[PDB]
A paper describes a structure:
Prokaryotic nanocompartments, also known as encapsulins, are a recently discovered proteinaceous organelle-like compartment in prokaryotes that compartmentalize cargo enzymes. Here, we describe a novel encapsulin in the freshwater cyanobacterium Synechococcus elongatus PCC 7942. This nanocompartment is upregulated upon sulfate starvation and encapsulates a cysteine desulfurase enzyme via an N-terminal targeting sequence. The SrpI encapsulin is 24.5 nm in diameter and has a T = 1 icosahedral capsid formed by the self-assembly of 60 SrpI monomeric subunits, similar to previously reported encapsulin structures.
Residue numbers in the entry:
A (entry chain A): 8 to 58, 77 to 305
B (entry chain A): 106 to 210
C (entry chain A): 8 to 58, 77 to 105
D (entry chain A): 8 to 53
E (entry chain A): 54 to 58, 77 to 105
The structure:
């Protein structure tokens, strides 16, 4: 008999990871958008009227929106347990991750801005038979034929499109972006995002042109913020309350503008639950 | 009202954009010059069944077999050709030109 | 017919003044007074009694008064 | 109660874009053609 | 700790958690100003 493992383990330093947040996503849409700074929170998109040359007198003004989160950390927790990991920094990091996920979801789904609600008449396409076939994506590419950037879809919709391509004996090509592989259709990549709504096996697929040089989709943000930690993101210390809770304010200022109406098209009534039966 | 945007420059810029669109339309459609009207006899091909199938584009390539540069088509016709290629189980390849992807046959 | 004024005005930066406060006055009295610093908020004015030379033993002490105002500004307004 | 957004917005410069013209196309044909200069407006193809 | 002082250690050693005592000190701004 000798020294046991459980007793010798009382002398050993455990390697501790930072807390793993499983709802973190790559947030591809934010990385693929072009971001325009708005120095005073107002973006006015002037338009040619009925494209002599006249302009409309009531152009849409985009107001940047504010989302705030208060992060409360007890002073004794950050005082006592900040070795080897800063407790305040981990709380803030995680908080900002959750806020960035919410920001991507708002870029897709917001009622004021938000791609699925700012789609022009004539740019809304419907599937012929529910499932996202190659013909439906060809329709989408008809609607955004001027230099389309990427498709945006739920990963289940990308799988359904892959099944439809397999049934027709068509293997779609792939591209590498940001060290990851994506399906492409007619050279246009299919980008996954779990923020595209999926309810009762029904979802939507978006097609986007991005950039200000083109007349595409642009993201908007506020450029010079006190306590800035990122694009349109700021962190401020709010103070300490009577119960020794230190508070931090995390602010995110963002919006989205579709500069011209042929920069965005949406394929509606996409069914992701259809499976083919292969019989020979 | 020329701060921060030059009004004359914007009017001229927009005017020139519209004129360039008209110029492309004239290069295609003019009655004097214009590709669709200056086509020689024997170079006019007809579709066998309406839809732009791979065989029709092969016919076109027969007519211009000496170093052809590109096809020119309406985007709906490119989509129709893509549908015809999908029905036959043929995925056509793509090339990158000017930072954009194009179907190739 | 050509480009109109209301449409061309959508491209123009407006010159914005700071908010005009009409109750501002020149406040001449403050500019005409002589101002004495009081390092610890207490000013005791000693006096000669019934002007030998004697002083009063209960001189008036002036306590500096405090007026406070809280200015609330939403963070999104100053940010945006 | 404090200063409101609509009132504070009266002090802010709006970012104005140039007018967006939706009929603009990439005009690929013009970019793909080869262009020959004709110094006196007459081109004779022998 | 060494158990029952081969050499073995106890597997449930006492862990001492540092305790926090807080006091809030309120001082009116006019008192410290004046």
């Amino acid at each position: 008999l000798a020294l046991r493992d459980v007793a010798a383990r009382q002398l050993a330093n455990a390697t501790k990871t930072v807390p793993q947040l499983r709802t973190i996503t790559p947030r591809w849409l934010v990385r693929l958008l072009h971001w325009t700074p708005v120095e005073a929170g107002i973006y006015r998109v002037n338009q040619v009227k009925d494209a002599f040359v006249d302009y409309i007198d009531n152009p849409r003004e985009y107001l940047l929106s504010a989302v705030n989160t208060v992060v409360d950390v007890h002073t004794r927790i950050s005082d006592l347990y900040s070795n080897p990991h800063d407790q305040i920094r981990e709380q803030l990091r995680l908080t900002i991750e959750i806020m960035k996920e919410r920001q991507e979801s708002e870029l897709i789904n917001s009622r004021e801005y938000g791609l699925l609600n700012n789609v022009a008449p004539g740019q809304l396409v419907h599937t012929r038979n529910g499932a996202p076939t190659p013909d439906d994506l060809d329709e989408l590419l008809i609607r955004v034929w001027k230099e389309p950037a990427f498709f945006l879809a739920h990963p289940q919709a990308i799988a359904a499109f892959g099944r439809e391509c397999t049934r027709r004996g068509v293997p779609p090509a792939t591209v590498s972006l940001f060290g990851s592989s994506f399906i492409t259709w007619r050279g246009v990549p299919l980008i996954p995002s779990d923020k595209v709504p999926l309810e009762n096996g029904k979802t939507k697929i978006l097609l986007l042109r991005v950039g200000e040089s083109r007349q595409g989709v642009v993201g908007l943000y506020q450029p010079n913020l006190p306590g800035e930690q990122g694009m349109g993101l700021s962190v401020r210390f709010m103070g300490i309350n009577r119960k020794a809770l230190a508070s931090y304010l995390v602010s995110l200022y963002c919006s989205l503008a579709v500069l011209t109406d042929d920069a965005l098209a949406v394929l509606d009534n996409v069914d992701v639950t259809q499976y083919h039966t292969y019989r020979y």
